[PDB]
């Protein structure tokens, strides 16, 4: 946890 | 006819010409030499609206030389070399946001404007000489530079050291900006400014830069600092030092603990606090309900030094509608 | 009775002084009966009958940019909604004399309505005969008009 | 329900267009082009370097992004 996506969330979802 | 219609006082010919629209005003220029000289009069040309039009540089140069105090021209394609020099213009309000102008004709045109009061060069690529010649104005109340590029720190220092009457400055999202550029920006911005938008720099922004910005400039009302990853929970003291801050809109400052945001509610003068992308669900409602005077997370976009703002298809740049304009197609 | 100073252009025409309070020259000369020499009988009687309407034309608004702008001119294609002396269908020469007289007396209403009427009449006409109707012999030579046509090739 | 299209290329540029749902398509500005501080407020979640450069009048709810290469 902590930073699962926050901080590096600047990327395309790619779903 | 037995009446000498050519024997008309100029005060009446100008009056009748005033009712003529722009696409027809060029037609009456060819009736006679007297009507030709009086067609290119400085009274008729006072508000130009060439929005989204393809213009040759000589055409716009001559039109500006005819005397214009407001030149709206977003998304134009003057991309040919300049030929003949022109007398200094008198453009008080200008708007060239998101245009296609190349640097050569941009320097050719902007090298004559020395009485400017407002400007907007959003998205336009610049160079070292063009920022240097913007120092000649020294009367720029508002300056928009979002998305600009091409200049070095010395040009920025000269620009913000010469223009000492800035009221707004949307210096945001210039991709080729290092720590030196941001440092010079916070150091040399005039203390008379009331609004700033130094956003989207990430690691290039440090707490020391915010400290000197808030120490040197005790007049800020809007201090949008978006995408500032290095603004931690200890930086709220600097904002507390501010006494006239009204709309501090942080964004995506991941180093900010959402709970500590209630501390920002102590500032009596604060009105709206746009905070995006860091506060999660569940706690957002608690923060909104526990702060019953702040309109948290209400306005999405920025009204910072922007010529046209709203949603009613406004055509006025900073409260100035353009009278003589190229009519958009509306016929049936 | 009430002050009824008359005009003077070679004849005598009675006009109420206070009713004709909109004319700049008449209002100025009031503070000094024997004025308005230049206006011809027909334009000045037309000005008199128009000036018989005072309250019906209301007053002047305070909004300089839009009111004089072409945007409100598109809203002013009615000229004056209430009749413009049969929509000012008078001949070109007498309209010219009327506009000259209105310029002399410096009345805003006539200098607005007549000017807008002239603009409407000369609006859509191609220039070839717009000088034939207004009787101007064009001074442009075959090269002089070529430059003008080249300049205005971007509208 | 935001759908992201496949990036295409061009000389020194890389383009991508994003379609918007009707809930947030009415909040798009019409008189200016947003910055990365503004369209990330709309919910779009691309990478760094995408600048809105043109607005499609027939289909306002489609956002266009270009990045230097």
Author numbering:
A (entry chain D): 4176 to 4190
B (entry chain B): 2093 to 2424
C (entry chain A): 1002 to 1033, 1038 to 1160
D (entry chain C): 3005 to 3073
Article sentences:
In contrast, low p27 levels are commonly identified in cancer and associated with poor prognosis. p27 is degraded via the ubiquitin proteasome system, where phosphorylation at Thr187 by CDK1/2 signals its recruitment to the S-phase kinase associated protein 1 (SKP1)-cullin-SKP2 E3 ubiquitin ligase complex SCFSKP2.
Local refinement of SKP1-SKP2-CKS1 provided opportunities for further modelling in SKP2 and C-terminus of p27. CKS1 also binds the C-terminal phospho-peptide of p27. Unfortunately, the flexible nature of p27 prevented modelling of the full sequence, however, C-terminal residues 181–190 including the phosphorylated Thr187 residue were solved to 3.5–4.0 Å. This C-terminal peptide lies over the SKP2-CKS1 junction, where the phosphorylated Thr187 sidechain protrudes into a small, positively charged pocket formed by CKS1 Tyr8, Lys11, Arg20, Ser51, Trp54 and Arg71.
